[model samples]
Target chain A: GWEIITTDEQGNIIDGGTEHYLKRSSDGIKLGRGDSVVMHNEAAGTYSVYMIQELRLNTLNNVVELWALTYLRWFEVNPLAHYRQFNPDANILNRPLNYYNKLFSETANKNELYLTAELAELQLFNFIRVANVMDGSKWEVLKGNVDPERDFTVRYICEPTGEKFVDINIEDVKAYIKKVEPREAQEYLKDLTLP
Target chain B: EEYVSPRFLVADGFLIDLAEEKPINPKDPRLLTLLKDHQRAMIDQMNLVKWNDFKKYQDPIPLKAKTLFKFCKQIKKKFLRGADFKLHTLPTEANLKYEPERMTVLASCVPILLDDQTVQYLYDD
Candidate 1:
């Protein structure tokens, strides 16, 4: 569970590594030997660069991370609009409230937008922040330890090609976002925009 | 407004509308216009025209797990439809050092492996 405190030769780090995140089931059971990156303490002195790691499942492949993504998926669906139609008195569909729904009316609403599938491509990396870390944003715990799974794995698209680049650069990513910031910026904005 | 929703990939042969409880005709103008524009938006957001490979899992299947998880991830990526990556199990000859707990770990952690890097191949393997 040591982390590369810094960089060393080329790709190897100096004193950082974490516990392995072997594949497991939804119920929590170990499967594969999982990945390994145990650094040698003696070699540690010779290690170049600087960084550190811990033994924990991270945002990449953990169920808890998946939980955040699931929330994100639901948020995009605009459950609130649907709920309102089903029941005018419904304050439940809106954010800040827990899950609540009632199809009170047959009346329809506008199309829902944005999603973790596309956005997560960007957000999975440090460069892509899905949104600011807000309420209910802390990593949820499953067991005594962090789940071991790379969330990015769930998003690699192999059809049109596997690259999920969000922008030519962060600048472009930001610009596209501003174009569709809405007359009044809503809680969130789409990373993609059209001319 | 440039709206977006979740769905299957181009290999799916047609776009799917997951936001609706019931089916939304892919042939409908409502959906067609959205596809023409939004599909470009997705590509633009991605900032690329074609990319069939990823650098992360390319090293090894660090992201291996359940058939369902793999199925959903592929569908979510829009690279293929659920029917394409449709859920199924790879049957191994009734063998093992039977370690449910350990096997469970891989099932939960590893990335879902696909038949080929190609499309249309169901999870029959």
Candidate 2:
């Protein structure tokens, strides 16, 4: 359903006018059919980055599947990156690019060339853009709501290890709740009755 | 150190069970059927590769197996909507008894846990 459009050096869409356009110098262009582009947000202030990749409608089916597989592989390679620890700022004003670079290095090798080369060689059906945003407010809000129990959980079973990973218990889930309200307002009203 | 059961760790949210949930029929019947067919195909593909012959190919077998695993995983998500769909690791005893010499084997059955009900689906490998 998406179409790839070539862009010039100035980052303008050269093929046609479209709402979503990947700049000419975008990371996506370097990606081959099986290559991947890792994008991150490391802005000092309030901002969020969104990526747009051009794709031909005919190849959508295959490309989508390929993208999902690549995403899973990426996650396996760097768990914390997908979990938003790649460029986190615990108590800092701005997210320094160096922090992200360090995170990438820690997860993978420190060689940018290796990372870029591996990604570029992968199979990519069309032009893609890996955009990063430096939004301050959004980052602060996201950082504020960092309760893991309330947000997400990973489940799995390990046979060789003889392990069973299951859901978070109801008690554990409840512990994360700061306060509880009665099912009905009448129940709360009745609780306020004088003894 | 005090000995603790793996179940306790799971209960404490320290670990996760991948095969805790059964695959569900997707809202779309076509997608559901496709998923079932894909699972069947993966099993067939694995069976076609002779254990001895598969080992001789070295790199190709694993690549093919990985591709099959990836397809099965995609089908699992498309139809079952489970995240992190993957192959089940076979028991060590079983592996040793069956094909000890081979470095790699076919990925086991699709192992996925449903997010909503927390049930695991175990397909025949």
Candidate 3:
């Protein structure tokens, strides 16, 4: 039935399992910095990893519906192996319906691929933009308001060519730590290199 | 967290730095190769039409009609060519009764190429 509520913390509904449900309030647990949680459903055979900032528990049917629609259209148009399903018996079942259970699994796999590709593409674009701004010089000045002390790191793994880029701020590195282990950043800093 | 300087590493054993001042087109050759592959796939599908076998069915008229329309569209898209691309030549009228025997006979008829234009047929071989 489309009435089951899934994640309930202390009897208060947090996330609906199958059926669409509403949250009473958003006061239960606010995801903290560097905190990551992976939610897995054994019955549904699905796993989703959420970053702390990306975590949100609410009734967002439109997003789910759009994903489902895109999955169905992709299957119909491309008709790839293990994706085409035309079961008449399953449709005529007298019990509760699992309209998109199989589709959800397939879409989950596709979404992971899509996300990885998208992240790599975004990183490559940003790399080009930053390089252009810097004009072949060390340390490109990032526009807008940014914290000078608090270091920002951008990590990306390009799947196509197995390339990786990891960027970090130099000032955030302690002098003692730099003396102990003279890495790329530390060496650059000692030589007064701007990166 | 400790700050680290930005580093780029390529693991495929091939590294070409774009930051170098070399006279090279920004548009990668790989993109053009992919586009060419896409075009080839579409053309292969278009060339799969067996017009002779397509016209053999007993009630091949409707099948021919659909194929004719498809052929005309293909010609318009430059995937096909020739003068015999008129839609009126193929039967467009629907059969009121279901005739399995007629359909079976029509299915056997081979499609003939009229002029230089061949009808576009799609589906399993």
Candidate 4:
């Protein structure tokens, strides 16, 4: 019953696999290594941006697993932590179930982005449905005819160490990312650098 | 045995130390350190549960229960039994009068987060 898909129902290249597919293809929305995408967090009622550093697969017993190695990016909100101000009295444990929904839906905050190189992983179940991100100083979503419930933007980069938002040269960011991942994975890195 | 630096109390479905009112996350790095070193596993199911000695403690101890010095000897004894052998806020070196009998029933629920197999093992056992 478990299967790994390199494309969606609409025939988009979801990600690369161990089989060594084409280095790059633009026939449609092909999310390859080094592509930007957003995954929706249900609890926070927010979309988090991540750069797919690697799409590696491994088989255990008889089941194949697809893993998306993604780098972290700050959310599209003013000061990032400002969203917590909505529910001052309640922490994560005591907050009402819809606290995050109200925080994102009813509250007002600036649309900002703070990208990072901090790494996290996602299994194939949740990895296949990411919205494509466009690169540049003003990061935008391509939407690809397919869509999320809503779209968001990412505008700045936050180095993992400093956690400060700054306008960084996309080339330098790309070079730093190349140094982060293994040399083999870097072979599949595409030229979609942000301006 | 080296006593835990920050002794914790079960309060509001969380483990909160005396000096700070904030609840600690199960995956907190400091907690992970303690778990790695095999420091005594803190509160388990017993701390969160109400006393079973019903003949003595006729009513469920309220969260804001008051000390019972004026009531019947059995009432004072039951309240002490309910609060006994649990984490305390006062230092161990404090005067004997200030220790033990200050137990309060706090809000608590089953922990759903899994770290290694501890949460599941605790749940199954």
Candidate 5:
């Protein structure tokens, strides 16, 4: 139920696992409109690192919802991968949610700061805003062909090269993403030289 | 344990700072520090910080945000040759103000832009 509250021994809210945003995947995972597995012992250092069975989105929601969405993204990735990246021996998975969140927040901010630095160097920010959401819709839905449930893609082409870049379509996600950039388009731009 | 700065991986939302005491409920009471620590680097670097109980603030448009709006027009005018650039000046701050009536949120405003204008779109692709 939307009432799924995962809390620690002190009953502090950790993952407010609400099913309200359940989208259309997973091998055998389906939660009703408001169902979730409430964690009973947050303080207990005992839980296994689990792979994301699948991923679902309830909103692109314009990324209006960011943290919980990104938090779950970790599931699909090797659960121990980020840990290894951050600290090979600091077994953080068995720690409190706050500690885990510390790891998540740090990782989130590091990537953000890195990219923000890139934009700062270029004197630009979220190129999406200027083209599609900003000064005008310079970027239209160039091309799209597929279903969001299984796989869907919208492409942005440059000139008449007509090559495509794939973006997902659905009411279930947020953020501007170009998963596959055509070779020709990729060639012309050597972007973001780290300062 | 090799120490790491918790703030290094932060985002603009609810989160924790392990170096400090944990608040029992993150909703109302924690807003002040959250905004400060979240924005501390900028505030501290500029040496423009002030504090109070459940209240914090500042008045400066971040440098990058300022550059972006200005840069957008420069690129457009030099290249497009057919439009005037109008910049949107917004409520700028580095503080969180508590609304006593609506105790859930400690709110503040920052400038956001992708264009000088806002419009609506209908999608079908």
Candidate 6:
């Protein structure tokens, strides 16, 4: 079983050491570095995605456990908190007519995901499944579930400040990540305040 | 829409249908090399997926093999778990006299093809 090690003020796991630790979850999920995953967000009643950067092992109460340092990314239409671009009332459940209209108009896609500079650490049990992301002519999600038969696509990448990029290249993303020092997870999630 | 075998195996440049768990013809040098290349490609693709370990523990024991099909079956079984892809046989009932070296009179003796691309469709996309 894995345990939660020391986290920063925002509750994201702190980087201890090692980049070679790979462990299976209690439910049988093995995550490797660079794999994209969807973690169950109980507070939001939906899943959040992340790109794994590192995995480490540490002791807690005399028990050793696995931990991960990841690049946090949020979905566009979570139930509790959403992209600030939407009105407070719009959500997956109690949606306004305009919300449905936007989806129909392709102005907003519920399955869309956005990358953030925030890094987080959590027990692997919180993971739902690996996400299939197609970062091609557009930053799109082909599959959100573990099932291989289903697929879809989307476009656009935006910062929390609303900066947008279309048809972004992977090299550009890698360069951006290399240049920008990531802030704490809470810094990016503060406005949304998921809980 | 024809009957499909659940598993297929290749041995000594011959095809074996696993439904019978049993076995083609005089092997061609050119065609045999192609068969060898096909199996090599499959192993290379399998290696692309970084399977560090199943559990927190790594299996250090050595595995011994008796036959080529037996070893291949072991590999196919290890990877199969609701996976989208599987080892299959496709018959091409065409005249073999046209290209004696490349074509086989028996469809089952045809060399299996391999994907040059990476096996991980998630990242390939």
**Local error of candidate 3 at residue A123 (angstroms):** 20
- lDDT (tens digit, per residue) of candidate 4 on B36-97: 23233444432432222222432333333111111102211221223543322223353566
Which regions of candidate 3 deviate over 4 angstroms?
A1-195, B1-94, B97-100, B103-121
All models, DockQ values? Answer: 0.01, 0.01, 0.01, 0.02, 0.06, 0.01
**What docking grade applies to model 1?**
incorrect
Which residue ranges in model 1 land beyond 4 Å of their true spot?
A: A1-195, B1-17, B20-34, B48-51, B54-125
TM-score of each: 0.18, 0.20, 0.18, 0.32, 0.18, 0.33
Model 6, B110: alpha-carbon shift in Å?
53
Pairs clashing within candidate 6: none
Candidate 1, residue B89: lDDT: 33
Give the number of the best model, judged by lDDT.
4
Candidate 1 lDDT, A1-195, residue by residue in tens = 111122232343443342232223334332111111111222111111101111223557632221111112221233344455446676444443122211211122211111221211111112111121111112232223432221111111111111121222222222333343222222232222222
lDDT of 1 at A173: 25
Candidate 5 lDDT by residue in tens digits, B18-104 = 322111113323334333453444323332112121122122122222312321211111111112221222234533554323212
The positional error of residue A166 in candidate 1, measured at the CA in angstroms, is 39
Provide the TM-score of chain B versus the true chain B for each model in turn.
0.25, 0.18, 0.19, 0.25, 0.16, 0.18
Clashes of each: 60, 32, 13, 0, 13, 0
Q: Looking at model 1 chain A, which ten-residue stretch has the lowest summed lDDT?
A: A44-53
Interface RMSD of each candidate, angstroms, one decimal? 18.4, 18.1, 21.0, 17.0, 11.7, 23.4
Give the TM-score of chain B in candidate 4. Answer: 0.25
Tens-place lDDT per residue, model 2, B1-125, is: 10011110111111211112122222223333223353334333432322223222212211223323432432231221113333333344443354323343343344433333333333332
Candidate 2 stretches greater than 4 Å from native: A11-117, A120-141, A146-195, B1-125
Model 2: per-residue Cα lDDT over A10-100, one tens digit each: 4545533412222234333432122224322122111111111222223436332212111111112222232242235632435543344
> Best to worst by TM-score, what's the order?
6, 4, 2, 5, 1, 3
> Lowest lDDT 10-mer window, candidate 2 chain A?
A111-120
